[PDB]
Amino acid sequence: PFLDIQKKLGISLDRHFMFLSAEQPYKNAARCHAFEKEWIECAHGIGGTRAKKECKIEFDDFEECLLRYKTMRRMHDIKKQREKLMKEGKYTPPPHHSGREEPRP
Amino acid sequence: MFFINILTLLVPILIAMAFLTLVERKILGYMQLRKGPNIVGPYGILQPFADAMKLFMKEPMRPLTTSMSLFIIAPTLSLTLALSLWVPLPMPHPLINLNLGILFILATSSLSVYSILWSGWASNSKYSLFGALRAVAQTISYEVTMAIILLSVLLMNGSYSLQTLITTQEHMWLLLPAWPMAMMWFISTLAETNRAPFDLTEGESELVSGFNVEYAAGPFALFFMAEYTNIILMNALTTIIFLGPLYYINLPELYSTNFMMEALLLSSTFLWIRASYPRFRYDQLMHLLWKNFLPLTLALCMWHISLPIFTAGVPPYM
Amino acid sequence: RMMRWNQERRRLLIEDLEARIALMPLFQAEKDRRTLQILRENLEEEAIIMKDVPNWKVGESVFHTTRWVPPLIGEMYGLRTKEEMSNANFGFTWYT
Amino acid sequence: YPSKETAHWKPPPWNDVDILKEKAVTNMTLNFGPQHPAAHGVLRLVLELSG
Amino acid sequence: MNPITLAIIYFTIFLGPVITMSSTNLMLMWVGLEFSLLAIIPMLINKKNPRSTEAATKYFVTQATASMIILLAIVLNYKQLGTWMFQQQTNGLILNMTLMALSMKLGLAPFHFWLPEVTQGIPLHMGLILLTWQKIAPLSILIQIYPLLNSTIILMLAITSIFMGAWGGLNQTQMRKIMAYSSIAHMGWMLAILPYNPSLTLLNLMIYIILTAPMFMALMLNNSMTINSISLLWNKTPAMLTMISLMLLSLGGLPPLTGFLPKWIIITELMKNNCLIMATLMAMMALLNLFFYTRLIYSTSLTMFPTNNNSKMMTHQTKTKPNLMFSTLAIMSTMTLPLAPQLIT
Amino acid sequence: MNLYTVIFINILLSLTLILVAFWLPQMNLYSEKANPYECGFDPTSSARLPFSMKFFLVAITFLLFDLEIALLLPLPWAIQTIKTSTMMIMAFILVTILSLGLAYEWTQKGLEWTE
Amino acid sequence: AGRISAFLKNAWAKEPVLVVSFSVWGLAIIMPMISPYTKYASMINKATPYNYPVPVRDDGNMPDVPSHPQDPLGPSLDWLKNL
Amino acid sequence: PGIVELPTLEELKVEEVKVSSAVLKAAAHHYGAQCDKTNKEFMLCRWEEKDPRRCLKEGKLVNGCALNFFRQIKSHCAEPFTEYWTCLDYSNMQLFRHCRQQQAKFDQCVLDKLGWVRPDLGQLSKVTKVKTDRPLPENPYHSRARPEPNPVIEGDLKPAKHGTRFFFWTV
Amino acid sequence: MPSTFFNLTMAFSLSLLGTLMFRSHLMSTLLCLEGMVLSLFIMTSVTSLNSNSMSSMPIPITILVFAACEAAVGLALLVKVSNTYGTDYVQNLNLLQC
């Protein structure tokens, strides 16, 4: 913040819910809690520029967890290949993907 | 089977609404030293069917100045919201089991107010405009007060579901701990349902007919059905919330019978009140609900915040 | 009366939650075993489907880390039926 | 620096309170009755109302 | 206004920027902006004239639209990164929308069209409160995200702010409009030095505030809203002409006044960052600003405009209006150039 | 799914009722039939004219009070917190501030209607 | 004071709603500060087990935590049972 | 990146408990009292090693303990437990308070036989220590090496050389 | 979720476009502001529900509170404008150019 009155007085008016891995009601972990924790643990103490340069792996893992762009691309490629194989008829779904299976608890 | 459940909820509610019209005529007559309808049918029991058939075989009005789209939209909206408000009530098992039941009730009630407002604006008439503005003021006052009342009651209850209210009143009515806000809730339901002395939108003597003064026949029937279904609805909600019927796990028919008797008593109390009292002035209704009910409601809301804390009677989450 | 009945209700709720706690390890074991089985059959189906696709690694993760990432509903029900997908998505919300 | 597009401007008032034309009060005119329950049948009460 | 509502409104006016500056969370910074806007509207419309009503309406819709764009940027950043602060990898589109909305809240060109109009039609003390206090919180928000902003868009906004401020101040005769275009030009300078060194942004902001406050106080002495009204000041308050001239020259950036120091050090930092073309264009438009200041000085101090007959009665009457804090601010905004290494950090 | 089904059934029922109400009876409409109602005389002016509102301040206060209601509504889950002292103090402060605002408006005659 | 009591009686006679509202406000303020059950509400909410009690790894150095749930050691709820 | 390693269906094969939720809730407290150690070991391994594939043996042990528990109940206390879980299954929430006579009879049966005691209020919900020979994972998050901080400069705070050095100012 | 979020962003863009492109009705401008507010609320709520950020779930309610205060002040200013002119016309609100 522009003024550090909260840090000078030691209080936390808004500093304890600044991100997903912060304090949560009834210990309900948010999505990508581990990824955001790793990103903050990497980026702490080295500054913004070094955090952008050197914690790129942690930031990319956190971003992939949060937005799931590559997961969507991979699933779309799998489903597109599956429907192409269905169109040319050289593939059939297994029973457990087609609705009839042996359920387990 | 679910469609059969929909039918056996919807159709008996409609027949109970029509016989509520008949029983209002009979009770008002016998309180006015007369008899009421006993010719049309054995004891007048065919009078609502006669009225319904006459209204649905009379031609509707489509005035030249009137916005046709909203004029059509408002009465069907009113009837749909009345039946939707009826749908989640537990007797002791609801057709649709919700978590935020009273929030659904509040949203649907405000949308019914919008049906009244759009009818009044679409029927391009000055008396309809008067009815719409009176509806605006009325729903302002009762909306704020009734919301705080229901908040305090459910703070005593612990959750927004209504089976939870049954479990809360398993041993004792909420009328005994919460009888002042029960009175204020009863007045709020009168104002919500637009019953005398707080009708003020179908103003018979002040206006001509108010918001539905340009409505005729079928749409007027839809408005009347919506209003009287809302009467039975709000009295059923009052007896579910405050006068808890006896609930036993082995037999729910006792709960249904006790609920029916208390809801009939509250509806008859509505008709009794309409017979007894003259109509408010609509600024006096706002002054009442904002100067007498609202400060006491805020005080009792603070009291019901404090009460489980210092009694350690914080209700369960489930 | 409301104080006494609310205290009794709190004790009953604590008893129900303790029953849930006692049953939770078995449910957790069954749930992760079922999730692992679903992921395994999805992996086998991916191996069957995209064996002819060039430059494709079967079962390649999208994360640089090697720790466990719990799969999404879209991940574990993407290749199954649309009714099962809708049951996994809107089942609890639309059950009234 | 007056031009053709700004030669019609006037200096602002010293007290920033402009003299505006007095708008006519458009009160609603209502025919209370004769077909009215409160008008006793044969009264045409022309009512000039503000609200 | 009764003292209860005076205390409530003034405390919320104070509390808005304080919450914005002290807040770690973008949402709390936004609600500080909401506090400032909502609290300052009734004091704008307090005189209850049509011009004050129009000024309050224009200010409300402008700040509401800009705050909605700010909230869009905050929500989009929360969607992208899961946090409530533009940390390092937030989208450039989000940052540019934040900059654009904060520049519309600040009132710099080409988002400047409301500021002379809002400054007109409100009383002088409210113009002072606006043009000094209302710019601190958006500048604090901009300062917190200085390494993330886009230098091209910032420099374009700054150069058009200084150009339009110079031309508007050249045209206007109303004192409130003149002060508003002065605000636009100085905000242009502050924005220009923002991405390179926010310490110089704070220095220029403090110099502008301590120069703007006593000029507005001297206007508040006689409610002189016009060039002519401030021109007959020699009959009313002859002892203020020298300080008026010195403060206007300091606003013009003439050495050896202390108002030359912000423009000088901002130009120096831009030369250190190799933006010579921008620095030279900004300096020439600052010369134009100094021109309309000098015309104001010619009207009020160096010449003597004709006076009225009732000014004799005004000289018969006595006044206690100039407060203790006027002269301190005038001296600190006039004769503080030799303390320049202490004024900079 | 069940709630959506019963909402759609209500919609279909009311649409069927209004449709049979409009297509069942015999139509005979003319100009005087469909002219607006003004107790037997022609309307002097249109009903779309501005119609003054004497409780506008109460309506704005209703907006603010409705948002106070929205703030107060998570109380049945807030009472389950571990730190009940903080929740109780904050709820007391909120209701007291709301009551003080209502009392100030009542003192300043904001609840009274204009004219 | 006599005038204070007369004003209070006049308020109770003419505007009893405000008197009841202020009295209920005052009672709701002062009642949790004098009741002996106030700590019990926070203790009940703490004792309500919404989350699973995650076991700790025993290194042989903490003797206070119980090895089994049916052990004398730990936060028993006999106060709630007899409440 | 690297491919994900997850076990096969043969490794995930186990004798599942084909037992309804009402039956489980009827036997809940005694299952939490008797099979507590294996369940707590499985929860400890799951909350220490976040990967579910590192705890399949503990999960199979949990299933085996539950199967042994239910086989013992079927061997000794079949009918009271059957009517108890039936009366529990009638309720929509499976509330314990609706069926207390059946609960009392089942508790009496599992008290006179098998010596089982129902846990009191607050016993199953408290944190318990547990002894295991499974090693503590030192890097459960699979974290990389943390980057080193900046080399903080130490030394005495000498005055500024030749003043502020701001253009022509001597000090 | 991404298609829904794109549609919500386009809804905000349309409401902002309506706010920036005035017609004669200041009330319609305020309604466009409220539409922008509604789009912001829905975006924040679906983001919090998607990321399971119960700690950030008070933020949409705070947005609604401050936005309703904004709408309240806008209605009060519209009352003052209508008392001045008889209509809420932004073409009537124009006499501060000189």
Ligand SMILES: CCCCCCCCCCCCCCCCCC(=O)OC[C@H](COP(=O)([O-])OCC[N+](C)(C)C)OC(=O)CCCCCCCCCCCCCCCCC
């Ligand atoms: C659902 C359950 C049953 C509900 C009741 C149903 C049966 C009764 C129905 C009666 C017919 C109602 C028809 C509509 C009537 C409309 C008029 C009306 O009601 O006006 C409201 C009237 C208004 O009175 P008023 O308007 O005449 O008063 C004048 C007020 N001024 C001057 C400001 C205008 O009364 C109220 O507002 C009171 C509401 C209920 C208050 C209950 C308080 C109970 C006691 C609290 C605790 C006290 C002790 C505190 C602790 C002390 C410790 C030492």
Ligand SMILES: CCCCCCCCCCCCCCCCCC(=O)OC[C@H](COP(=O)(O)OCCN)OC(=O)CCCCCCCCCCCCCCCCC
């Ligand atoms: C004439 C035009 C009329 C237009 C307006 C129609 C009004 C309808 C009646 C009023 C509705 C008010 C708003 C209700 C919103 C949903 C309320 C709610 O809480 O729903 C939640 C509920 C289940 O959620 P929960 O209680 O948490 O349970 C989870 C575990 N059981 O349930 C769900 O999650 C189900 C989600 C869907 C519920 C709403 C279905 C609406 C269907 C569309 C109606 C309009 C159709 C379009 C117009 C047709 C032509 C006119």
